Amino acid sequence: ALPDFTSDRYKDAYSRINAIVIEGEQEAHDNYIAIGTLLPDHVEELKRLAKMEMRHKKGFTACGKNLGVEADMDFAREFFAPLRDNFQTALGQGKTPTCLLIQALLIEAFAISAYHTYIPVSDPFARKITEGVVKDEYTHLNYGEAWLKANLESCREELLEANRENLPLIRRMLDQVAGDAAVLQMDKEDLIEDFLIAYQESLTEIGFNTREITRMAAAAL
């Protein structure tokens, strides 16, 4: 069941998946620095999170180089454009809960699911890099959960709107990546399950009840 990492079929799918991961890590760095303009007293902690994202980007860049694959960066920029646009719109409006739901919850849960699914089918070099990134994703999810949990009473409606608008974009991103992910021997059903479990667990931690969460996860449709 392990893929042939040297085949043209594998390298072609990897060129797009690796580019999406590299672009995602760069946008994650940018997003935590941007949140620092909304939360000036959190700047040092956000800089630390942004620095971890740069370490992840460098590591995944090395994964692509190791397989002799040239990352399709243009494809990756277009892939993130819808979610990036919604983050920039919220940032410009000073909407911190929306920025945090997009980056610290949706994007981190998407990263956790993708990385957990990739690890058992990854090449030995990439496996170590991916394993060394997963602990940091939980740190980032925890940061977002902690702020939203402390501020839930003033941003309940905003979070429901942010979820309604952005959860379907994650669903569309999963649909667009499924073909290439299957070449990498990753099952779309495992990616969906792991993402929903991480996202539902974060919403539970924040303080949403079962009914609220069910209504929220249903927005994906």
Ligand X SMILES: CCCCCCCCC[C@H]1C[C@@H]1C(=O)O
Binding mask 11-50 for ligand X (x = CB under 6 A): ------x--xx--xx--x----------------------
95 in contact with Fe ion (CB under 5 A): no
**Which residues 140-159 are close enough to bind ligand X by CB under 6 A?**
140
Choose the one of ligand X, Fe ion, none that binds residue 114, judging by a C-beta under 5 to 8 angstroms depending on kind.
Answer: ligand X
Choose the one of ligand X, Fe ion, none that binds residue 21, judging by a C-beta under 5 to 8 angstroms depending on kind.
Answer: ligand X
**Which residues 75-114 are close enough to bind ligand X by CB under 6 A?**
107-108, 110-111, 114
56 in contact with Fe ion (CB under 5 A): yes
Toward ligand X, which CB reaches closer, 62 or 210? 62
**Which residues 163-202 are close enough to bind ligand X by CB under 6 A?**
177, 181, 186
Cα→Cα distances 155→24, 90, 97, 194, Å: 26, 13, 7, 26
**CA-to-CA distance for 72 and 182, rounded, in angstroms?**
18
Choose the one of ligand X, Fe ion, none that binds residue 112, judging by a C-beta under 5 to 8 angstroms depending on kind.
Answer: none
Q: Which two tokens stand for residue 56?
A: 């992840």
140 in contact with Fe ion (CB under 5 A): yes
The residue range among 50-58, 87-95, 118-126, 186-194 that interacts with Fe ion, by the rule CB under 5 A, is 50-58
- Work out the number of other CB atoms within 10 angstroms of the CB of residue 214: 11
| Contact residues for ligand X, defined by CB under 6 A | 17, 20-21, 24-25, 28, 53, 56, 107-108, 110-111, 114, 140, 177, 181, 186
